[PDB]
Every structure is written in C-alpha cells, then in structure tokens.
C-alpha cells in the first residue's frame, strides 16, 4: 500500500541518508546496476548513448528498477545477449518518511491528531538535477537504432521530461573519438580489464617503461 508517486516528487527536505541515527530502513528495491557484457574491452564498443534528465525532481528506487528491466528486455531480443553493456548511474540514498494515521489512531493509548507527527521511514528515493545522466549504454556502431529505441521506450516509467543524446566520446571514457584514436596510436595507453590507463611522465623510468613499452621507440 505504497503512496502514489505524486506525493513525493519535489525536493523539499535536506538529505536524509541512513546512518547511526535512523535505523530500521527497508532495503532499496534495486540492487543490480550493470548488465550485458560487463567485461568487454574498450575497443569493442565505441558508441555511447546517454539518457539525460531535464528537471530537478526525485526518482524512486522502485521506478528505477522497473525501467532497468524494460531496456534489458528489448536489447537482448533485437541485439543479442552479447552485444551491449548497460549501466545505471543514479543511486538512491535519500529516505522519505510517512506518518501513519488510522492505524496509529487507536483507542488504546497514544495520541491521535497532529501532536508529535515526526514520521517513520517508508522507502528510498534518488535526487537528480538538470543535465544529470541516468542511464548509459555502449555498443557497436551498427546498433544505433536499437539503442535509441530502447531508451525511448524506457523513459515512459519516469515522471517528468528527459532527453536522449548521442555522445561524442569513445565508450565510457572522457576522450573525444579523434583524440583517443590518435593518442592510442602514439602509444600512451595501456589496456586494463574493461577500461584503460594513461601515461603521466612523472614516475620513475624503470616502472613506466615496463607498463608502457611502446611509448619509447
């Protein structure tokens, strides 16, 4: 018997995370955050698409998890279980309260009304801002249409307004396509499991030349 999501939409209180002060909060509904080939190298999936927010509101953990399922279903069917990597980039840490009335409006003992109305935990919710990213997907270059439809269908489970933007970077890295391409050719790039590391020319020679042998020729 959860309250309608219209009732918790505007950020009206200071952040209220779980700590040694409020104890006994229910576990957030969503737990998984990565799906697909979450161990693919950076050179396999060079296309990245994001779903960006456009208002300053609250998104509930229940809503986030439901949206996650929708995108996963569509991508698996039309692109294959081994052709994408999806990541959710919004974690719910804000606790919203509730004041029970009728159940707390009993004849025996206690007080009925608005006397002493500090509430009890009732669930968790995520705070988003303008321009914040919610869901990211990386895949090949021939899955443009597939990725776009998945997010467009995903958004119907969130309240508010969101946009879909095709990024200009390479994968999940903060580098533009041309710059990353030419820098890797220069050789100041070392592959890691599902990500990369870069050269910094401030360590000591012996360790740097082992890690990046191709930078010196």
């Amino acid at each position: 018997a959860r309250r309608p999501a219209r009732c918790y939409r505007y950020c009206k209180n200071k952040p209220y995370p779980k700590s040694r002060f409020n104890r006994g909060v229910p576990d957030p509904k969503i737990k998984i955050y990565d799906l697909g080939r979450k161990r693919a190298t950076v050179d396999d999936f060079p296309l990245c698409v994001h779903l960006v927010s456009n208002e300053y509101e609250q998104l509930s953990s229940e809503a986030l998890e439901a949206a996650r399922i929708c995108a996963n279903k569509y991508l698996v069917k039309y692109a294959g279980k081994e052709g994408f990597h999806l990541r959710v980039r919004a974690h719910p840490y804000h606790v919203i309260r509730i004041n029970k009335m009728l159940s707390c409006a009993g004849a025996d003992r206690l007080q009925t009304g608005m006397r002493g109305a500090f509430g009890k935990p009732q669930g968790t919710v995520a705070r988003v801002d303008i321009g914040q990213i919610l869901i990211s997907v990386r895949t090949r270059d021939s899955n443009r249409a597939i990725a776009l439809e998945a997010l467009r269908r995903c958004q119907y489970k969130f309240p508010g307004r969101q946009k879909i933007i095709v990024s200009k970077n390479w994968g999940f890295t903060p580098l533009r396509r041309e710059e990353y391409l030419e820098k890797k050719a220069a050789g100041r790039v070392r592959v890691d499991g599902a990500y990369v590391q870069f050269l910094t020319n401030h360590g000591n020679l012996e360790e740097n030349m082992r890690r990046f042998p191709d930078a010196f020729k």
Binding site: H50, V52, I133, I165, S167, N169
Partner: protein
C-alpha cells in the same frame, strides 16, 4: 535547548589542520602597556584564563597589566544601548593589532613633509583624497591590430 559557557563553539575554539602541539614561544616575549590596541583570539589548547565566545574576534584597549594576564576594555551592544565590559585574558590569547599602525606611519611622513616644504617654499598638498576618475590619453594601434569576435554556436559537450 541548553545554554552553556561553550555552547556552539565546535569550530571556533578548535586548532587548525596540521597546527597541533607546541605553541611558538615568541608569543611569550611580547610586552604590553596600558593604552595599547590589542585584539582577542582564543587558543583552544590552553584552558586557563580564556574568554567567553563573544569576545573571540573583537578589539579593545589594554587597561591593566599583571603577572601573566592583561585587562582589556571592549564595548558590548545590548538592545538600544552600549555597555563597556572589562575582561581578564591571558597573554596566550592576545596579540598586538595593526589597526593604528597605518595611522602612525602616515603621521610621521606628514610631519616631515611639512617641515621640508616650509624650508623650500612650495605648498604641501598633504591630506589624502579618494580615487578620482581617469584622465584623457591616446592609444596607438601600431603593431597591435584589433581582432574581431562573435558569439559561438550551441553544441552538446557530453
């Protein structure tokens, strides 16, 4: 709701970061005389002879000197009137103030400018004055030619 002698002094009376332990000994070598302008700044590591949290940041006039403490006069603002408070503070919490130092420096030059000018025979123009508006001048464009600007189009960065 309580009101103790050190209520709400969590960050004021604390020492800084990477400033702990020994007190620099140059503090104990200064000297004070009545009429000096000092300002109060409490040190958390010394619990004897320390002032209430209100005077942390105020400035006053010494009026008494003792074995290891000085008496300072400061003006408190109660509703609709001022009162003069007389507090005893240990010298570990005080410091000489540079509030009047500019005035003393300026008065010395004023005296000597006036003396020198009287011997020579030209008026003084000694008292200061605020910043007046600028004056006319010329700017050449030789070897510096202007560059044309324009607003930039919109594009997404992420």
């Amino acid at each position: 709701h309580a009101a103790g002698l050190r209520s709400g002094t969590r960050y004021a009376f604390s020492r800084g970061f990477r400033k702990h332990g020994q007190i620099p000994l140059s503090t104990y070598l200064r000297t004070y005389r009545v009429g000096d302008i000092v300002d109060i700044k409490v040190n958390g590591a010394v619990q004897k002879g320390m002032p209430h949290k209100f005077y942390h940041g105020k400035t006053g006039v010494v009026y008494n000197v003792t074995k290891s403490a000085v008496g300072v006069i400061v003006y408190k603002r109660v509703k609709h009137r001022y009162i003069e408070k007389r507090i005893n503070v240990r010298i570990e919490h005080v410091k000489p103030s540079r509030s009047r130092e500019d005035f003393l420096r300026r008065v010395k030059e004023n005296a000597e400018l006036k003396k020198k000018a009287k011997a020579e025979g030209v008026p003084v123009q000694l008292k200061r004055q605020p910043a007046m508006p600028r004056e006319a001048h010329t700017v050449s464009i030789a070897d510096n030619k202007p560059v044309t600007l324009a607003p930039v189009a919109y594009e997404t960065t992420i």
